[PDB]
Amino acid sequence: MMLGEHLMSWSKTGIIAYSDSQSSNANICLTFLESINGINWRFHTPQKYVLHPQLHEQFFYNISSIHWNNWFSLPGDMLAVCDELGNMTMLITGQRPDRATTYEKLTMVFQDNKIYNHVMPLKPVDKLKPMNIERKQTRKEYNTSILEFRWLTSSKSVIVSQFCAFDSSSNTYRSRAQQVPPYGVYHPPFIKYACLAIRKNGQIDFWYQFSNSKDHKKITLQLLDTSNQRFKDLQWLEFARITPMNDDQCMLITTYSKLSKNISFYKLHVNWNLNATKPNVLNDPSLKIQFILSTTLDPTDDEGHVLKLENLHVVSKSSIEKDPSPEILVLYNVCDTSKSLVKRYRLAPTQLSYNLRRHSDIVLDKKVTLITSEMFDAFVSFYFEDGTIESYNQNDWKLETERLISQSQLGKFKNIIASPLSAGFNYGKLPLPPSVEWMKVSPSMCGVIVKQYNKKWPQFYAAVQKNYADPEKDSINATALAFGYVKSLHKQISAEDLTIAAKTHILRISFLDRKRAKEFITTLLKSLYSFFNISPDAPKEIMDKIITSRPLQKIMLLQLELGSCFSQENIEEMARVILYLKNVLFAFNGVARNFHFAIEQISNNSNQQQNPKLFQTIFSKQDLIHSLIPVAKWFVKFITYLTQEILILINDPTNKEYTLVHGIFGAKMSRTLILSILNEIKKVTQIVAKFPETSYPILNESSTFLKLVLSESPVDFEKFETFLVDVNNKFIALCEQQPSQEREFSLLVKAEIPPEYAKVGDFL
Amino acid sequence: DMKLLRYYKNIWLNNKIINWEISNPDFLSKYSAITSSIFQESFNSVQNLDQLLTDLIETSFTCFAQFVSNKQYHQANSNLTLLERKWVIFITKHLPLLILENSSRSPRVVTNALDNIDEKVVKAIRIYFTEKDPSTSLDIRHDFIKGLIMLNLQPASVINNYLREDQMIDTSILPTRDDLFVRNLQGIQEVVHNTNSFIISSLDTLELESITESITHDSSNGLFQVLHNFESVAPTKQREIVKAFLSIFEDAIKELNYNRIAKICALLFFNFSHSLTTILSFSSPAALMKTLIKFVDLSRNGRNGSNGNDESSEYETINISLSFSWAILLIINLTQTYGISVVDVALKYPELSIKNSFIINFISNLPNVSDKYYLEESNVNDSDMLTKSHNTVQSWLCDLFVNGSITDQLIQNIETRQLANLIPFIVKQVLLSVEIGVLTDISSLIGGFEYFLQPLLLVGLIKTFYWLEQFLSCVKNDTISEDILQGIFNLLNTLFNPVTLNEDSKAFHTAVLRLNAIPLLKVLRKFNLEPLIAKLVAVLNVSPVYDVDPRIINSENDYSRKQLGYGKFLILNENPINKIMTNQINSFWSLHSSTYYNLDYLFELIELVTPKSFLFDVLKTLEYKLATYGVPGSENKRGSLDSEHVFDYFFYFLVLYDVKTAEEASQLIEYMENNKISILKRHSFAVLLHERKLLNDLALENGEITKTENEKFISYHDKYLCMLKTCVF
């Protein structure tokens, strides 16, 4: 039997929403990955919910498919689930009718049965009282049973990377990122969202919401637009795969109706703006359909063995590839033979001097039980019977795990790597599909999710490498995992799966030689900077851009997890203090800009004193500065720790356990960042002194306390200000004395000084 | 026990009638052994011959009763009549012979058999006939007795016993002798003492023009009169006539007699008065297929020993072309309407080269034509033939569209197989060019398409009509101006309504238009238009068409306020797939509704839902009904033996849908106990059950499945084997 290709969906924000078929009080579950003790990981507690058609005011039905709106560049928070009865239930997470909430709390938008608006925040089953709802099983495949659900993206563009190559001239890996223009059908900004669903009887649906209204609208048609309803209700489509094509507002509805035993093709057209001359009049989009082609399947192979169509998966192909025609991969299995044939067809127009052109045939040695297409990766995954997975690339259908062995090394570009799977990281012995409810390869292909019948919790399997004793392969592996994150950030993926896989390999290295594992981290994170065209050895102008960059919230988090096992080590400590300084940065300069605008509001709003709006405005002015006082206590408490270590290190310079103090001062932007914090602190105090609170003396305590805490600090800030300023100048002249770029990495990440610069350490 | 016996026997007869196994001389043996096989305990009763024939009589009558009385619950247009005609043919033809050489000629036993029937069958038959329509309304019982009279089984005084008390039948009028009588040219009923000589003598003097234009029955040819009067043939004589064709046809293949091969195929294709259905109903279609596909495959060696240097060559080449071209049309008609697969026969007979079979891959790609022209398909890796492949295309286009004549050199140098694909290529190029606007001159083309109707080029029309609907379906949705559209009809009408036809091409042209007429009619009506439908309806009325709504053919003025259904199986929203299968669950579990014993409405339903979803949605849904309601037919919820027989109903039905012949069963037992076996049964349940049995056993070694779950699955598997081994198939 075919597995649950759409039973589970990894949302782009990490929420794992999957269908539940065992609990008698719930049908859907929500969970996510969390860290146990900084080293290990565990899934979060399952948040069970119950979905029935009568939430608007009682038996609930099973869940057919779950589709997170993670397609293209969508935010990925609006989850729409379609049940077995055909009702499409849309749940929005991260928002409440009155306020904003976290990502683990759900909320409804509208229910379909006719469609109506009813906003109501859902509650978990366990917390809710025992209700009179029983699991009624809709064991009937209705006319409205949705076969395939597809989301509609907006007009925004997505920028990703295609592949990287090893530049033998510079002995470094180089990657190029190509912007991907939108292809297929995209909804305009004035429409809040749109989605399409194909029902098993051929009836189509088009849900959409206007951005300026709350009422929802639905437009429905049927594929077989014949004059007789006798054939209208006959199109029982076995497979209905919707692949958008480069044609404008067109989707190729590749259907296989067993009534006529032919793989029929269709074209769907939508006009977003019917009246372009009247932009104010927002008209409903018009839907059109046009039959194109139909072909019959081949009965036999070349040698005389008959074939059976097991699956019909067509790849969502963009215009980037050489031939943009979608690949209709009609799978065939030779009976009583381990071989499995995958014939490939392409749809092309008929040219004068449409049609399906056969390119080639590919033979696989094991039977296939599941096919899943990766998103933004162009990878077809063949989940064979024995548990092994062979992901074939869309470009050449060359095995990714064995591409390095068979790659033609000679050439301009060598060692073409697209994912960590190219290095050789193969999954272990996965559980057999008969025992497995559903599988899904993780987005980065680093591991596989398996749900088990007797396991109440989801499992997880990571990739392993057999030749971990060979030291010469560390250069390639670090670069391969470096590019794995490069694609993830461009697609706004959490990439928590990739983090787990990297740590396991490092842990096995550290068991034999602890010295070797430390260098693996340094080389791995260095390639990230080269891939993203960011240089820690650049002039100071780019350095300001680095501090505000989102990646440091994640790339520094990498060593926060990859260095957790190393007790009494400063690799994670160096990243955390810089990361927390960023939080410290968001505290003062986050409100320094806010406080500056409050100065102008005082003068222009001084003509109405008795109004009931100024009194709340006045109260909020002096309340905000009060909340900064607890932050300032940790700000002073932080600078004392580094000054305390100065006295300790002088007596015993040979103590390696206190080498963190070197990296903190060595960081180039941190010295400027603290100076900027000290600059705005002076500006804030000068402004407060220049513009004190006079209407209410009682409110001056917060302003006065700000002056007192600075003066009463055990160490004067002015003396400490000159401390970091002098370090910057001395560390710049040393660069001109001898050119070196590793020292920039050493002062920022390694938190150490190379032995070749042992004289520099004595100066501190 | 009696209910189990009757259900098993009715399903067994239905399956065996569908499987064309009536001609098997083991019918009576299996029918007698049914009673012993059903009951596991020994049942050693000496059943006398009269008892067997009586049991057969009431079983057949009750089966026909259920078959005709279950039809009102079907959709009014879900029309499938092959099995209805098959029941009629069996009951009127074989059962009289079964009595003739199986009975002891006892008039009493027939009276007891036909007097023990319930009046419900008679009431239902009369009600259905009255609803369809005093006018003469004869039942199947009258035809049964009439056949027995001709065989000297019963005297003429027996028919009056069962007649209505107010109406008798004159004894003298009823025929009593089994001798063949034919109306000659002078109106005297001549006695055909010898059958084989009559066929060959008429066949030699037969005219191919007299096929469709001879609407009147007063034709000088005796054999052609028989086809239009096929419903009144004597019981025992028609077996000789069917056997006469087989011996003659096999001898024509051995001697390579091209004249009589082409003529024979023309008679069988058109199926006047259900002539073709009776042929399959006597010879097994497998043996007919084997010889027929041998000719189309072994004809390659026959073209290397003939030299075109005689004035009889053009006579021979036309005779060769028509003999080969007609033999293709016989296969397509059998595959499409009669539900036979060309792939299956190759697997069963090892002497057929599957990889080098041109017929096998031709049928499966019949409606689709390649955009590129290849002289040979197995050697696409070579470029030498592709150089002259384009030469052939330009050589034929210039000679036929500009020169206006077909040179004899072109015909001699090319084979029939290349012609079968060359003609669709050229017509597609011309028709596409006309539609776009590349070709603007029609009159020269109208004459140009006339050259496609010559006897030499007749085989090229087979693929021309199939592509038309795919061409027309795009045309129907696309916006085409009437000036172009009227041109399309003008070019099409040349093939549809020829101005003149040769004496060997007139019957062929009608025959090809008859294969793929039905989908063409549906597309055309969606829009010089009328003549095409008028021609299409004319060729559709020459003989009856199976599984077609009669309202569609004659919808010129009838408006019944009900939309027409062109397909065999039709579904509405008022009666969706849910309601019927929910009624199937009521029948799969409680044997309710009335859609059972109708393998016409059930076999197609299974395919439309696939065996996987069909079995998955019923096996696990049974527990919900069983856990709440309980086993029907028992007032006590004690014991599992009562539920055991209910499970036997479901598993016995699935066995017949998988096993189709006698020796096949002896080979499926070896498939379970562990290549060629599962090839023929790709979609069988047995393959699905066995493939999961081995797979989950692998997990048992690895221990990802609980032992209880594995034990449950094998319980279904061993039950399937246990009934398979204890019952003879």
Swiss-Prot record, chain A:
PTM section of the record: Phosphorylated by KIN28.
Keywords, sorted A to Z: Activator, Nucleus, Phosphoprotein, Transcription, Transcription regulation
Signal peptide start-end: none
Subcellular location: Nucleus
Entry function: Component of the Mediator complex, a coactivator involved in the regulated transcription of nearly all RNA polymerase II-dependent genes. Mediator functions as a bridge to convey information from gene-specific regulatory proteins to the basal RNA polymerase II transcription machinery. The Mediator complex, having a compact conformation in its free form, is recruited to promoters by direct interactions with regulatory proteins and serves for the assembly of a functional preinitiation complex with RNA polymerase II and the general transcription factors.
InterPro entries, sorted: Mediator_Med16, Mediator_Med16_C, Mediator_Med16_N
Extra information: Present with 1720 molecules/cell in log phase SD medium.
GO biological process, one term: negative regulation of transcription by RNA polymerase II
Oligomer and partners: Component of the Mediator complex, which is composed of at least 21 subunits that form three structurally distinct submodules. The Mediator head module contains MED6, MED8, MED11, SRB4/MED17, SRB5/MED18, ROX3/MED19, SRB2/MED20 and SRB6/MED22, the middle module contains MED1, MED4, NUT1/MED5, MED7, CSE2/MED9, NUT2/MED10, SRB7/MED21 and SOH1/MED31, and the tail module contains MED2, PGD1/MED3, RGR1/MED14, GAL11/MED15 and SIN4/MED16. The head and the middle modules interact directly with RNA polymerase II, whereas the elongated tail module interacts with gene-specific regulatory proteins.
GO-annotated cellular components: core mediator complex; mediator complex; nucleus
Gene: SIN4
GO molecular function ontology, one term from the record: RNA polymerase II-specific DNA-binding transcription factor binding
Family classification: Belongs to the Mediator complex subunit 16 family.
The protein's name: Mediator of RNA polymerase II transcription subunit 16
Chief subcellular location: nucleus
A Pfam family annotated for this UniProt entry: Med16_N
Protein's organism: Saccharomyces cerevisiae (strain ATCC 204508 / S288c)
From Swiss-Prot, chain B:
Protein name: Mediator of RNA polymerase II transcription subunit 5
Listed GO CC annotations: core mediator complex; mediator complex; mitochondrion; nucleus
Record's keyword annotation contains Transcription regulation: yes
Superkingdom of origin: Eukaryota
Other comment: Present with 2491 molecules/cell in log phase SD medium.
Record's function text: Component of the Mediator complex, a coactivator involved in the regulated transcription of nearly all RNA polymerase II-dependent genes. Mediator functions as a bridge to convey information from gene-specific regulatory proteins to the basal RNA polymerase II transcription machinery. The Mediator complex, having a compact conformation in its free form, is recruited to promoters by direct interactions with regulatory proteins and serves for the assembly of a functional preinitiation complex with RNA polymerase II and the general transcription factors.
GO process terms (BP): positive regulation of transcription elongation by RNA polymerase II; positive regulation of transcription initiation by RNA polymerase II; regulation of transcription by RNA polymerase II; RNA polymerase II preinitiation complex assembly; transcription by RNA polymerase II
Subcellular location: Nucleus
MF (Gene Ontology): transcription coregulator activity
Subunit description: Component of the Mediator complex, which is composed of at least 21 subunits that form three structurally distinct submodules. The Mediator head module contains MED6, MED8, MED11, SRB4/MED17, SRB5/MED18, ROX3/MED19, SRB2/MED20 and SRB6/MED22, the middle module contains MED1, MED4, NUT1/MED5, MED7, CSE2/MED9, NUT2/MED10, SRB7/MED21 and SOH1/MED31, and the tail module contains MED2, PGD1/MED3, RGR1/MED14, GAL11/MED15 and SIN4/MED16. The head and the middle modules interact directly with RNA polymerase II, whereas the elongated tail module interacts with gene-specific regulatory proteins.
Family: Belongs to the Mediator complex subunit 5 family.
Nucleus found in the keyword field: yes
Keyword terms, alphabetized: Activator, Nucleus, Transcription, Transcription regulation
